Design a protein around this nucleic acid. Structure first.
Lengths: 104, 176, 159, 168
RNA sequence: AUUAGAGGUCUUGGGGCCGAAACGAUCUCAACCUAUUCUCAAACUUUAAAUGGGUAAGAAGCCCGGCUCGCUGGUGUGGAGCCGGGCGUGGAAUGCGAGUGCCUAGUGGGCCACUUUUGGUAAGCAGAACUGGCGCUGCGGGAUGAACCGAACGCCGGGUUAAGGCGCCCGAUGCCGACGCUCAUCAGACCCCAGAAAAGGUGUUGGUUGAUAUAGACAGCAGGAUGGUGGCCAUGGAAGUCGGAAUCCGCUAAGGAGUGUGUAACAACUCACCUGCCGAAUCAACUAGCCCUGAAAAUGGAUGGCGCUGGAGCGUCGGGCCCAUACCCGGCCGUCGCUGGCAGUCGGCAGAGCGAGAAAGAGAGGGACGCUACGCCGCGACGAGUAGGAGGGC
RNA sequence: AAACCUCCCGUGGAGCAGAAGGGCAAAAGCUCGCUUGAUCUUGAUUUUCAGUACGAAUACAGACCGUGAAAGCGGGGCCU
RNA sequence: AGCGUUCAUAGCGACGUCGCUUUUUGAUCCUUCGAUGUCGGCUCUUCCUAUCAUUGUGAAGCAGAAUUCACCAAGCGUUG
RNA sequence: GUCUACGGCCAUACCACCCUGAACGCGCCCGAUCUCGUCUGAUCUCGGAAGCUAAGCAGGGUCGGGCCUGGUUAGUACUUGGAUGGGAGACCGCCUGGGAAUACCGGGUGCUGUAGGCUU
């Protein structure tokens, strides 16, 4: 009473029913498995990021105004083009008032 | 290549794509026999790809025109050179015909090879159609029409319209 | 059935090429890899340690962790109707900087160049790659010469 | 000689049915919007598009349409995909409502965009529903084999205009 | 792995040969070596495709400025992490709204086909790869049929088709169909598919190649058809005829040194190469079409049947024509979608519009029906189904 | 013919415990010297895979050590 | 190729090769295990021809006799 | 033009034989007291500078081998997709696309980074 042993027959069809979903991409992937000695330093750089709070607010602000001076030192044919202007609602009102007197 | 209808003759020329390596390729003229010009330009690539290293992806058709007969009201003896394949090996042939246009002869050659040798149209490669005189003929089945005083009756006549008066009373005469 | 050995069927996958056996060139080591580089895998037989599996020989991924002699890669592996973004640790010897990315990085340079340039000219120039169009109408000069006539040759039994 | 421009437009008609179709072919025939037999569509030609047409060569019968061939298809079988709803084009304010952001405000504009493939073909051609052509009056030659070998599948370059006159 | 000769040298040697004896010499025969040469490899390979497998084609990106670090250090070096600010032509084509979480039945004997493929002589056998089928599925066609070809199904009217057909059964060629091919005392007659091979044919139709012809063919008829010689080494005799070797020439159209018709050999004659009359095609070998031989089983018998031979057969091909539940058009039912529309039935406290291509204001200084809103109404698209799941049952 | 000695040629035709394949020439081989990384301890990952184990394996990290002038290398066997 | 004095094919026919047949055995497991009564013989019928005899014939190494080989042919026989 | 040191690429750089090498340099070469190591100062280590391009090395040459790169083989082999194509089969032909490899015949025979000399 032997039987079949193995077959990948219906399988490729079975997989594409619900689609072969690519793995869900997302920014800020997890920091798991990264080596500890580099990670251990990285947590210290995040622990002492408040130390430069006063410098940073007093660095970009003086850089905020420095940007405000580089600006302050500076600041197919006319026939179908014409008919395209009469056919405009918001800016052709004054135009087609010339036709309204054409019946008059 | 399905030899359907009366064939025509086409002068199709082509060339390779222009490249910085070779400024302008040479032009290649052929004489294709095909039902429509579309299957002519396809049959063109089939020959040029075996006489040259050119394919349709690296060539361009330059002119797909139909050539007409120079004298369609003159009877002519045409000489055809074939390359057909049997069930066992390929052979060269020289078949002779008698018709009014070369395309009228090529069609006749395609029906004949299918009739006399059971060869389908995709097996035959016409390579040369030459107009020859009545003295350069070789096949006897066409030489017998070379007579300024040819004369022959019509023998026992296969009666047509045999269904229009389907139930007649008289025996149909066959001697006209 | 088959065996589940790690290197089953890698007679030619990890074998060194012809006339290239022996010590490996040193620029394969002094080539640097930051985080997030498009990096492909090609197993090298001469370095037994740090070898990847045979299912990644050819697969391309990105780096997420860099150690002394190795990198961690996030590569995709299809396993029976689903893709897995699995992390593997491979030595530098089985690693190349994939050039399947920089030709887009080159395209970013001119796209940033031609956007700043020609802006003061007030013109609008194309940026996107358009596929190869059908060729335009042109002439063909056939000066003097006539196109040569071709003919199918007869049959010569060559054997 | 004068080598004319290679045609920038093509009309694609599906000839084979839906039973027993290769998965690579089936994916392409639904990217050309040809889910039904004897459905038509316009396709602008380029290297990236012809190589998709080679994949479905046994299933389609495409060629280069004529100016009259576009007029009959848009007038008699033109249906706009307005809000994911197949709606007939019995009035110009159905086109200009949706295609007004591309200066297409009539049917002659819509034909001018399709026939002379412009820079707004994609929004124009995706606006038209796939054409539900009829069965070919007069009968095909052979549905199976390629047009060159007597059949009807493949690139029947200019003869596609004859096929339209009967199917439309 | 394997075949064959070549050219090398004593590079060792097998018996040799004048040599006591010598790489002194001898023809050699071997290996051995060097250029070549024939044939191969699922478990060989320098080369090496087609098809195929990843990745990329931006805003999570670019480009500035500055902080933090116990990490890294000649070097605010290196790298990472933080802030802050600036750049949208959305950076290939095509198509399409996506993401995501619960709970979960059935199933876990499969089978067939193109292509690839292992074992086996093979199998409607056993075992795999890829795709599609059947199972779960009707329909048109293949006479018949789980799987082949077409095409997938709500209920109908019209039109048109597919694959198949169109002498009759049997819808459609009752076409002034085309050009051939074939005669079978076993004709042949349409994928899967249901039956034949080597070999052969002066059957016939094509071809291929090489020779023969006014210096004359091929047959035909009629003439020399001898001779040294009746050759001898000779067998009793062979004188053209039992059996091998010499297998010439002069005369000269020419005569083989005798292929046949008989004795002991002749006589006898007709056989070669040539004469003639008559004078235009003929011979030789291959080749491939149809046809025939090769071809023998048990109930009576099967191109489906009848029957068909100016096909109703085979080959190449025409227009026409026939019809599926497929396609187009129209109706009706239902489901799905628009997460569509309607409380505006706002009436002498009235004034009847919001279908309008274009981000926004009909702004103030006496009158049918309807709307069980769990109701009513309008558009599109769609409809197979076992196991199984759910919903609704006036 | 084959003991030992010397020169020359020698891309691996050898060797590396074993089956085969891969790999290896100032070495992974051979020969010497010093040694115990075949030790102690978290996790992450790979392989089979249900993406569970066991086994085996790869990258680190924290220790204590070996060796080396040093860079380094070593937490068993060149890999399977 | 040879045997057959001579002589390939009257009759045979090696080395090879091409089939046919389902009266041998295999192979297979498709149908039947809520059963299809599983060896022979006896009895009785019909069918097949790959022909032993008989009718008609061809070929022989057929003189006659006897015996081979082949064709049309299964009508009729093939016993104690 | 070129060399030395350290290299990158790892034969267009290799191999065989022949030729020529100004200057510096690299070498050869002379020695063993010390350092160090051998059976042996050959090698390794160390101290030198009488000699020398003889060799290594560099450049060059060879109808050179190899290697590198083309042509040819060849649109051949093979192959994706398609047919109610052919064939008793074995297998072949066509449509649609992609497309090799020897023999054979050519061309080529190291580029180059950093530092330092020499030719002043």
């Amino acid at each position: 009473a032997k039987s079949k042993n193995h077959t990948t027959h219906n399988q490729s069809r079975k997989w594409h029913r619900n689609g072969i979903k690519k793995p869900r991409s997302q920014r800020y992937e997890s920091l798991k498995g990264v080596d500890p000695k580099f990670l251990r330093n990285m947590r210290f750089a995040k622990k002492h990021n408040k130390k430069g709070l006063k410098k940073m607010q007093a660095n970009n602000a003086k850089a905020m105004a420095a940007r405000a001076e580089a600006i302050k030192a500076l600041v197919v044919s006319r026939k179908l083009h014409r008919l395209a202007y009469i056919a405009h609602p918001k800016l052709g009102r004054r135009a087609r008032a010339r036709i309204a007197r054409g019946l008059r | 290549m399905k030899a359907s209808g009366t064939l025509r003759e086409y002068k199709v020329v082509g060339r390779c794509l222009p490249t910085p390596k070779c400024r302008t390729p040479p032009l290649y003229r052929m004489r294709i026999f095909a039902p429509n010009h579309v299957v002519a330009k396809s049959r063109f690539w089939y020959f040029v790809s075996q006489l040259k290293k050119m394919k349709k992806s690296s060539g361009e058709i330059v002119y797909c025109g139909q050539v007409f007969e120079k004298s369609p009201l003159r009877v002519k003896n045409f000489g055809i050179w074939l390359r057909y394949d049997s069930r066992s090996g390929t052979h060269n042939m020289y078949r002779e015909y008698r018709d009014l246009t070369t395309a009228g002869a090529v069609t006749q050659c395609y029906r004949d090879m299918g009739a006399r040798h059971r060869a389908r149209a995709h097996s035959i490669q016409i390579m040369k159609v030459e107009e020859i005189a009545a003295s350069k003929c070789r096949r006897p089945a066409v030489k017998q029409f070379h007579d300024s005083k040819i004369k022959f009756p019509l023998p026992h006549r296969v009666l047509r319209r045999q269904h229009k008066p389907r139930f007649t009373t008289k025996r149909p005469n066959t001697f006209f | 059935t088959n065996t589940k050995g790690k290197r089953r069927g890698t007679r030619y996958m990890f074998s060194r090429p012809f006339r290239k056996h022996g010590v490996v060139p040193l620029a394969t080591y002094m080539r640097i890899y930051k985080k997030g580089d498009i990096v492909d895998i090609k197993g090298m037989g001469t370095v037994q340690k740090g070898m990847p599996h045979k299912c990644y020989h050819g697969k391309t991924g990105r780096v997420y962790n860099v150690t002394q002699h190795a990198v961690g890669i996030v590569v995709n592996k299809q396993v029976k109707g689903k893709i897995l973004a699995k992390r593997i640790n491979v030595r530098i010897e089985h690693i190349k900087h994939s050039k399947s990315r920089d030709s887009f990085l080159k395209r970013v340079k001119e796209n940033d160049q031609k956007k700043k340039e020609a802006k003061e000219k007030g013109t609008w120039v194309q940026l996107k790659r358009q596929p190869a169009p059908p060729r335009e109408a042109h002439f063909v000069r056939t000066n003097g010469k006539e196109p040569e006539l071709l003919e199918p040759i007869p049959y010569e039994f060559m054997a | 000689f004068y080598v004319p421009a290679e045609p920038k437009l093509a009309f694609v008609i599906r000839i084979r049915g839906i039973n027993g179709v290769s998965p690579k072919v089936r994916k392409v025939l639904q990217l050309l919007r040809l889910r039904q037999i004897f459905n038509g569509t316009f396709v602008k030609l380029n290297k990236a598009s012809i190589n998709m047409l080679r994949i479905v060569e046994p299933y389609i019968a495409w060629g280069y349409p004529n100016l009259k061939s576009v007029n009959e298809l848009i007038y008699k079988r033109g249906y706009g995909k307005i809000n994911k709803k197949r709606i007939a084009l019995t009035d110009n304010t159905l086109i200009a409502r949706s295609l007004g952001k591309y200066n297409i405000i009539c049917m002659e504009d819509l034909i001018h965009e399709i026939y002379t493939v412009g820079k707004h073909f994609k929004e124009a051609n995706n606006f038209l529903w796939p054409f539900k052509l009829s069965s070919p009056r007069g009968g095909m030659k052979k549905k199976t084999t390629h047009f060159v070998e007597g059949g009807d599948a493949g690139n029947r370059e200019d003869q596609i205009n004859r096929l339209i006159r009967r199917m439309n």
